[PDB]
Sequence to fold (620 residues):
Amino acid sequence: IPFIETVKMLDARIQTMDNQADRFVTKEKKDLIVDSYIKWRISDFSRYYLATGGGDISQAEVLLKRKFSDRLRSEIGRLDVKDIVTDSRGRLTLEVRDALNSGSAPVINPNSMAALGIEVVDVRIKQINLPTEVS
Amino acid sequence: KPVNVEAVRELAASGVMLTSDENVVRVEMNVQYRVTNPEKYLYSVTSPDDSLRQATDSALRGVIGKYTMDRILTEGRTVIRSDTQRELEETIRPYDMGITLLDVNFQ
Amino acid sequence: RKVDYSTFLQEVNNDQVREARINGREINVTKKDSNRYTTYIPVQDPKLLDNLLTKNVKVVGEP
Amino acid sequence: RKVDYSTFLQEVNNDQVREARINGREINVTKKDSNRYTTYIPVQDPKLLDNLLTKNVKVVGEP
Amino acid sequence: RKVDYSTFLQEVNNDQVREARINGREINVTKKDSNRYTTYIPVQDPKLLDNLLTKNVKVVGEP
Amino acid sequence: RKVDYSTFLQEVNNDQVREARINGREINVTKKDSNRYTTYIPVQDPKLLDNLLTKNVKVVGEP
Amino acid sequence: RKVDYSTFLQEVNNDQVREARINGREINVTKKDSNRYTTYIPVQDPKLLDNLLTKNVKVVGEP
Amino acid sequence: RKVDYSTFLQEVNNDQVREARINGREINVTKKDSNRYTTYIPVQDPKLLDNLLTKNVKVVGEP
Fold:
């Protein structure tokens, strides 16, 4: 209906969000520099549009960053640097993805990404570097 | 007066803190919250967001005070957040603000 | 709402703003807590843009 | 009341100023003791706003 | 398609831009994968061209 | 009267000017011996205002 | 025939032009091999004069 | 007669100019050997005024 109904377009294609270099602390206080990327899709378009003011992609990316950093650091804290490098099945990444998709308390946890209109489909680490002194 | 009930609001609280074993740590935290019952949000506390930020900073300081440095660095990163969220919820209870808490995550 | 320029700089230095739409002197500030207000640049401040980019604040120009 | 710019400066560095409003070249200066006097900028000073901010002086823009 | 200033500088520092068609405040930006968009300069920036030439991107002007 | 800009510079370096009234382009200089004359700025000099301040020379703006 | 500003900068960095006729934004450039063209400045660039002066490139203004 | 800006600056560093009457975009110049000519700033250069002041070269503005 003209002048009464407006339309907002939300892309259902998978969006890719990459994280710049950042430092993580392992169990032996060995500092690591981790590059990782996440792929996410919108599950409930109305819920996603409500949760992020105006349905802006950057607003959702900010929340995704905030949660993903916490879960990834909490997972790395219990691990050895050798355990991280020798990991080939992506067990920690899969666990991080499961934590992001299903939070901790058909009930939906408020801290889960399902409470928002976001579904995380894949989490991967691109490169693991050392501080220049250690290298 | 319109209140943005559905939108998720973000808050950042960071500071240099003293641990239990006389050590000093640079700590940051992010807190995501919603607002419900807007009458409480509007007619209870002046600038509820600033009050919540101050309460979050106080709770973070109190939680970090109890634990030691190395556990905070590596092992306690899960109990730190769990204690901080509970402390913040207990702290903002008397204010009876409209804000409800979604997630407290340790950065 | 109108908020003073020095107060806005204290706010951005404390990590409280998210995006800033700059229209000449006028600036439309959106805080991280979804509160919006408007400020005005007193005089030409070269340090303003550097401070905004340094604190990871979204900056948006207008036609 | 009209007051020149120099003594306004060493009043700023001696922190007797509380709020300064700058519409154009002129500045509406308020002292700590709630006495207000207008000042005129002789020529644009890049260090002016920096000096005002470092001394924790309240700065107000104008529409 | 309009893109903000901060993300444009992030792309420049991350090297996903080839040439920049600067027309006044407007900047017509082409990514290294031939993606076209437009960004706006909010306030006069003294260092954008320094980074632009540091990252070796073809900057052009407009009559 | 009229006086060269470099003459004004070396004059204020030796500390014998008292009051300097700035009206945009023009300068109305007052000497320590009650001598008044006029000076003009070649081009915008940021160091001018700093130099006048550091030597305790009164500076007065105009509307 | 119009030449990119960036290309102008790495070209003059290689000591290959002689004259720079500056007409506001546009510049008339002659290389060492008697090749003449026009280049456009995107924005105001203070380092332009310093770079041109350092590398013994002659500059001429216009009325 | 018009004299090139690069030649002008080199001649100033040679200490051979006595007076320089600057008319905004224009400069009217007298050599030490009573030779009169006219030159042009390509783009605003405060280092110009710095060099003329440090070389004890007379600088003249006009209404």
